[PDB]
Amino acid sequence: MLKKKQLTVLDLHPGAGKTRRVLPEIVREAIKKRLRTVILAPTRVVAAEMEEALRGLPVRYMTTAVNVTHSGTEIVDLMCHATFTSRLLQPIRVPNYNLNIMDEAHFTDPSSIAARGYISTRVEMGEAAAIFMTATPPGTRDAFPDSNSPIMDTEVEVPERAWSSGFDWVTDHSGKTVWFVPSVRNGNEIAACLTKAGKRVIQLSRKTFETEFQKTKNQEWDFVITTDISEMGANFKADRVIDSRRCLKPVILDGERVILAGPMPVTHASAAQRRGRIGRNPNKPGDEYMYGGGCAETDEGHAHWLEARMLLDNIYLQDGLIASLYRPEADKVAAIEGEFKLRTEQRKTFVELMKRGDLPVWLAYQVASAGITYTDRRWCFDGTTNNTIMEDSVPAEVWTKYGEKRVLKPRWMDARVCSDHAALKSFKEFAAGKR
Numbered sequence: 001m002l003k004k005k006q007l008t009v010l011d012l013h014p015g016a017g018k019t020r021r022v023l024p025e026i027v028r029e030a031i032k033k034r035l036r037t038v039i040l041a042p043t044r045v046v047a048a049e050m051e052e053a054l055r056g057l058p059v060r061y062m063t064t065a066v067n068v069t070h071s072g073t074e075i076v077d078l079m080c081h082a083t084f085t086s087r088l089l090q091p092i093r094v095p096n097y098n099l100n101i102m103d104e105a106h107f108t109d110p111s112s113i114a115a116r117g118y119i120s121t122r123v124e125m126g127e128a129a130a131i132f133m134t135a136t137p138p139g140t141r142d143a144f145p146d147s148n149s150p151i152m153d154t155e156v157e158v159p160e161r162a163w164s165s166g167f168d169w170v171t172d173h174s175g176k177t178v179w180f181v182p183s184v185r186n187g188n189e190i191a192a193c194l195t196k197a198g199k200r201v202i203q204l205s206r207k208t209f210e211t212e213f214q215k216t217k218n219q220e221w222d223f224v225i226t227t228d229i230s231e232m233g234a235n236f237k238a239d240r241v242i243d244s245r246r247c248l249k250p251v252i253l254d255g256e257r258v259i260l261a262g263p264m265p266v267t268h269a270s271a272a273q274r275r276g277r278i279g280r281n282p283n284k285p286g287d288e289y290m291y292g293g294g295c296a297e298t299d300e301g302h303a304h305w306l307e308a309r310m311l312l313d314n315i316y317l318q319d320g321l322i323a324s325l326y327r328p329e330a331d332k333v334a335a336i337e338g339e340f341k342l343r344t345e346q347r348k349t350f351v352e353l354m355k356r357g358d359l360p361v362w363l364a365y366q367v368a369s370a371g372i373t374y375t376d377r378r379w380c381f382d383g384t385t386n387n388t389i390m391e392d393s394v395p396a397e398v399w400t401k402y403g404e405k406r407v408l409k410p411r412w413m414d415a416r417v418c419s420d421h422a423a424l425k426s427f428k429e430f431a432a433g434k435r
């Protein structure tokens, strides 16, 4: 498993012990063989759970998720998937790891897809070994995998809006429920409906994840309302999962704008991960999984795979060679390897727009490829009238860095910069020259 040119997919069922049992065994064997090793966690929450499983072993934590005492002689590094991809893109030296271990290797965020591409290409080249740990590898068609204890699976209509009647089963429950919603906005309406009925609700999303997830451990709750981010190793002490079976899909229209299409069906892998939150305790059988729709391969044509290609085109591998996507997910995008390769100065702008600007990959690429410099925000105001960003059904307005009030109307429109209140507030700060 640890030999050069080998890529292993450890596909044990959810809760089988990949992180708490198998990962430390692998790390001990890698240290015995003096293999320079990287361990990739999807989120800071998973990184903290990994430190608990690896405690005592000499691991260098390159994350603020944990607070440990290092010796300086560690040959095993632990960081998030995004940090690995960010460091590859930046003019920072990244060691050429002998062993590459990716936990929750099903993560479909662009930086995770790019990390799999870079790693698998190095393995194909005969330069490294890799282990991708996931219950749902790319291409899985089983939404109902094995579990530690039996699960009651029920197809039922699940609310996507506030309700006044017809869903008594939702509130008549006395346990703890994890409910997967298609978006932050949809979660706000369901959470408000449950709060008015006397329930204690915690909401989770990408931006608020580490902070709000702590509340699931620090206080008593009845419902957790979450987006797809909780498919990546987030663990709960719950007895039911309510799953809309829906997600939003970023889609590039006419190569010129990004829209959030849907809500549409989740993939079989996402459905199995959502369901996999329960049935984890062998002593507590009969955890419930209520699902409100079917599965479909909605990852085909999804912007994240095109965005992973933009990132891989700008990562040095060897001379002019460019890393390919991991083979089981390489057909999700019709992109040409190297088509997004930028020249030195535009590449630096592209990286800064993502790292400091916090812009989506696609949008960062349009601005950098147009030859615009990082601090030049004229593009946020000179787009076509149909690119006007709306706030409360009226054009959103910002004071520019020049002191002038202007309508927010970006030259390139990406729906992710204004999908919720928090996102639009961050984009207005960017358009104003505040970061």
Ligand SMILES: Cc1cccc(O)c1NC(=O)c1ccncc1F
Binding pocket: 060, 061, 062, 063, 064, 066, 067, 068, 069, 070
């Ligand atoms: C070693 C390293 C290299 C580069 C970036 C990093 O973020 C770290 N980690 C720490 O400084 C660190 C984190 C957590 N606990 C102790 C620690 F020293």
